[model samples]
Target: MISLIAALAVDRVIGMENAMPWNLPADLAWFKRNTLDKPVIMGRHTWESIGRPLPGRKNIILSSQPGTDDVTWVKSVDEAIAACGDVPEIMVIGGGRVYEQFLPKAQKLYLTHIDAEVEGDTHFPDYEPDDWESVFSEFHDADAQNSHSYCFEILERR
Candidate 1:
């Protein structure tokens, strides 16, 4: 299934100046836990934000330029999807534009809805609430490792 994984502000703000605006280690750890061993497709900007291929997962990056042998590079989203080779699940990890393109086709959304809003150059696309059904939901209060409270949600298209 095509799935999307993102940590976004409730107002849909995602990034600013190519980096995430907030520090949230717990959210990152949660993201890592769920995406382990999965093929993750991400836009070039997102790849840059990460700096290197994530260990224990297949990193498929959508980029016009070639990357080093450690990661698979594709020119388009279609190519990225094709590179996954019939996996049971493929995750579209993001930057705003990439999410905009994949949101329509994705069957499931793994969302970390952060409880803060800040101005950002990149914003996630809007979707109708009625189109998706929440399959899982968990809320985490802010802790020392994470500055903002957030809720994790798995929404399946209905």
Candidate 2:
């Protein structure tokens, strides 16, 4: 199964630049816990933003450009999926274009819906609610560390 994971605003804004706008430790931990043992596929810029390979997971970097060792680089989502084989679950981590390109094929969406609005240059593609059915949701209030309340929603394509 392919999964799309991200934290976005009410307006579907994901990032201002190439990187995530906010930092939420709990959310990061949640992401790590869920995607840790699976294959995590991302675009080249997203992989660069992450700095290095994420431990405990198979990191598959997708890039049309070249030159990188110990990293599997693919030009298309099909190639990435093929590399994943029969792994029950694979995480599609993002940078905008990657998410837009692969969202249609994603079976599950693990989203952290943030409450605040923020300006952004990059955004997630608008997904019609009617096309996806929510399977689970968990809400959390803002705390000392995080500036906004957020909720995790797991949606299955219908």
Candidate 3:
């Protein structure tokens, strides 16, 4: 199944000045926990923002330009999907444009809901609330390592 994984603010803002708006260590940990060992697809900008292929998963990058050998690069969405090679699941880890392309095709969503409404240049794409159902969710309070409280939610297409 195709799925999306992202951490965004209450305003749906996902990025600011080419980076994540908040520094939430627990959120980052949760991201790694869920996506570990899975095939993950991301856009060129997201890959650059991350600065390297994330370890422990197959890093599949969709880009118009060629890139280095650290990650698998595909020029189109179809090629990206094909590169996952018949896997039961793949996560669309993204910047806004990539999310726009895959949101319609995604069957599941792993969303980290940040508690703040921060200004950002990039935002997560909008989807119809009625089209999905919550599968699992949990709240986390702020700690010394993580400044903002957040919630983890998993949604399945209805």
Candidate 4:
């Protein structure tokens, strides 16, 4: 199965200036819990945004440019998917284009819905509500550590 991992502001902003606009440790931990040790595919921009391979995961970059041994470089998302055949699920982690390209094929979406507005350069592609049926969700309110209220949502293709 193919799954996607993403966080969005209530205004639909995934990122600004190639970085996440807010600080939410809980959300970060949630991401690690889900994607660690999995094949996480990302676009070049998204890979650059992190500046290095994420630890404990097979980092696959879909880029026209080259990459080193620490990371696997593929010319297309299809190539990245192919690189992870031994795994049961492929996780698409992104900046805009990569997400849109994989949406049609993704079986599930693990979304972090942050309850705030923020300026952003990257945004997730819109999806028809009917196409995915919500399978799970857990909401969190802002606390001393987390700046905003957020919800962890899992949606499965219908």
Candidate 5:
């Protein structure tokens, strides 16, 4: 299944000026735990935001932009998946435009719905509730390592 993962604001905000607005180490750790060894396809800007290929995962960059030698450059998300070796799960990690391009085809969403609102120039795409069924969720309040309260959800497409 193709999955899209993100830590999103309730209003769909995800980033500003190529950086995430908060430093939520717990959430970052959570992301790392789940995505390990999976093939992660992201837009070039998202690739730049992280600065290098994530150590344990296959990195696929979905854009025409130039990238480092280790990345498997592709023209689109479909091409990225096609090159991912018939794997059962491929992940679409973000930057707004890439999410919009892949959402319609993704089978699952691994969402960290952060409850704070900070100004952002880029936002996630809107989806209808009718298209998804919530399979799992866990809620947490802001803690020492996380700046905002958030809900982690795993939603499967219906």
Candidate 6:
């Protein structure tokens, strides 16, 4: 199964620039715990932002052109999905373009929905409520110590 993992603002803003604007330790820990030992497919920009491969996960970077031997690269989403073989679950980590490319095919989504109106250059696509069912959600309030209030939501395609 393919899953999309991302943190978004109240308005569905994903990033102000090419990178995530807010830093949430809780979100990172949650992501690492869930994605460890699983295969993760990402775009070149996401790979670059990470600086190196994440330990304990198979990193598949998607690029239209050939990539360096240091990293495994696939020419398309189909190739990346194929490379996963029969893995029961794979995560699609992203930059905007990669998210858009695989949104239709993703069976599940793990979204950290931050409560704020962000001014972002990058945005995630809207999904029809009827086409997806929310399976889980947890909310947290933002304190002076945190920049945003948020909830982690998991949705499955209906």
- Pairs clashing in candidate 4? none
**Candidate 3 lDDT, 14-75, residue by residue in tens:** 85336755789898898899888789888877777887788988999887887777578888
Task: For residues 5-25, write the lDDT of model 5, one tens digit per residue.
Answer: 988886888864367667788
lDDT of 6 by residue, 1-158 (tens): 98888888767877534655666777778789879988988877777788879998888888887787565678898889887778999888876788888888888888888877768667887899878898897888776545677798888978
lDDT of 4 by residue, 75-146 (tens): 887788888778987888876788888888888899999998877666788888889898887999998889
Candidate with top lDDT is: 3
Give the C-alpha lDDT of model 4.
Answer: 0.82
Q: Which consecutive 10 residues in model 2 have the weakest lDDT in total?
A: 14-23
Regions more than 4 Å wrong, model 1: 68-70
How many clashing residue pairs, candidate 1? Answer: 0
Each candidate's clash count: 0, 0, 0, 0, 0, 0
In candidate 2, position 38 carries an lDDT of 93
How do the residues 25-56 of candidate 1 rate in per-residue lDDT, one tens digit apiece? 98899888889978888877777778778899
Error (Å) of candidate 3 at residue 6 is 0.3
Q: Local distance difference test, per candidate?
A: 0.82, 0.81, 0.84, 0.82, 0.81, 0.81
Q: For model 3, give the 10-residue run with minimal summed lDDT.
A: 14-23
Report RMSD for candidate 3. Answer: 1.4
Indicate the worst ten consecutive residues by lDDT in candidate 1.
14-23
Give the per-residue Cα lDDT of candidate 2 at 104.
Answer: 76
List clashing residue pairs in candidate 6: none
lDDT (C-alpha) at residue 28 in model 3: 84
- Evaluate model 5: give its lDDT: 0.81
The list of candidate 2 runs beyond 4 A from truth reads 16-18
RMSD of candidate 5 to true structure, Å:
1.4
